[PDB]
Amino acid sequence: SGFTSKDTYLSHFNPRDYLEKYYKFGSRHSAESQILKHLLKNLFKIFCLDGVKGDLLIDIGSGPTIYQLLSACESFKEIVVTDYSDQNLQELEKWLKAAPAAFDWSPVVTYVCDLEGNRVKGPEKEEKLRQAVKQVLKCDVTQSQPLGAVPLPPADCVLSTLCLDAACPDLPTYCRALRNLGSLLKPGGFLVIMDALKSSYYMIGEQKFSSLPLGREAVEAAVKEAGYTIEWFEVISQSYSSTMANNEGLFSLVARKLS
């Protein structure tokens, strides 16, 4: 081991656990909820207020979540979700069929439906997404071909939340990650990434997963220095509960692939 290996994810990552610990979106102002609320506002600002639209968006390291895709789905016609953990894909798929024993995302869904103008209702927001999500593929950011042999058109947007820091055991592995992800996008295409800053781990209940503790300095470096212009970059100091993670806040950026 050392830094959580690929198949520690295959074997110890519990989708349902994860969701409960991070995504229950309680009415009590928990660190996990403050952070979630912010990822939300940002994703709204990016996909509904800015000029981030397109035909195709690949969401990388989706894991078992969809919150990151509630706004994007008012901007893209085709949404391909991906993850390295087959059992996370299984949990997402549960939600896409809208099965009764799927995690309940409506507090979240609700939160978004306001941000956006309360124009549409939960039910209609959820349907809209289900129809966007066209495929659910296996992926690996540490491979020059993250979706393997699967044929997809050059994407307009690659997006990733709380993934690259987790999958990348070191800096070089990260920058290659970024480069490999760049191979899925057309030039002038958008890279949206949201991760934790200076995070060395995070806990899913009892089990602990590694994490490359990156500064804003190094992240910006490895992105410019990996083929992208940065449209904006935001840092929030707000962290996860100490029991949860050792992060120092979280960044999010929007980057353009050089032509």
Ligand X SMILES: NC(=O)c1cccnc1
Binding region for ligand X (CB under 6 A): 162, 165-166, 195-196, 199, 202, 211, 245
- Closer residue to ligand SAH in complex, CB, 54/146: 146
CB of 1 to ligand X, least distance (A): 17
142 binds, among ligand X, ligand SAH, none (CB under 5 to 8 A by kind): ligand SAH
Q: Any contact of residue 62 with ligand SAH (CB under 6 A)?
A: yes
Question: Of 33, 42, 75, 161, which one interacts with ligand SAH (CB under 6 A)?
Answer: 161
Summarize the annotated binding site for nicotinamide as residue ranges. Answer: 195, 211
Q: Any contact of residue 88 with ligand SAH (CB under 6 A)?
A: yes
245 binds, among ligand X, ligand SAH, none (CB under 5 to 8 A by kind): ligand X
Breaks in the chain after residues (C–N exceeding 2.5 Å): none
For 255, the token pair is 């980057």
Helices (H), the chain: 6-12, 15-23, 31-44, 86-96, 106-115, 122-130, 164-167, 171-182, 216-224
159 binds, among ligand SAH, ligand X, none (CB under 5 to 8 A by kind): none
Contact 209, 166 (CB under 8 A): yes
Q: How far is CA 223 from the centre of its chain?
A: 17
Summarize the annotated binding site as residue ranges. Answer: 18, 23, 61, 67, 83, 88, 140-141, 161, 195, 211
Distance CA 97, CA 94 (A): 6
182 binds, among ligand SAH, ligand X, none (CB under 5 to 8 A by kind): none
Question: Of 25, 43, 46, 61, which one interacts with ligand SAH (CB under 6 A)?
Answer: 61
Contact 250, 43 (CB under 8 A): no
Those residues with Cβ within 8 angstroms of residue 124's Cβ, 6 or more apart along the chain or in another chain: none
Distance CA 204, CA 191 (A): 27
Distance CA 5, CA 84 (A): 11
Question: Of 140, 182, 214, 239, which one interacts with ligand SAH (CB under 6 A)?
Answer: 140
CB of 145 to ligand X, least distance (A): 24
- Closer residue to ligand SAH in complex, CB, 157/258: 157
Q: Any contact of residue 139 with ligand SAH (CB under 6 A)?
A: yes
Q: Any contact of residue 163 with ligand SAH (CB under 6 A)?
A: yes
Distance CA 138, CA 206 (A): 26
Question: Of 47, 76, 84, 174, which one interacts with ligand SAH (CB under 6 A)?
Answer: 84
Q: Any contact of residue 85 with ligand SAH (CB under 6 A)?
A: yes
Which secondary structure element, helix H or strand E, spans residue 145, and what is its range? none
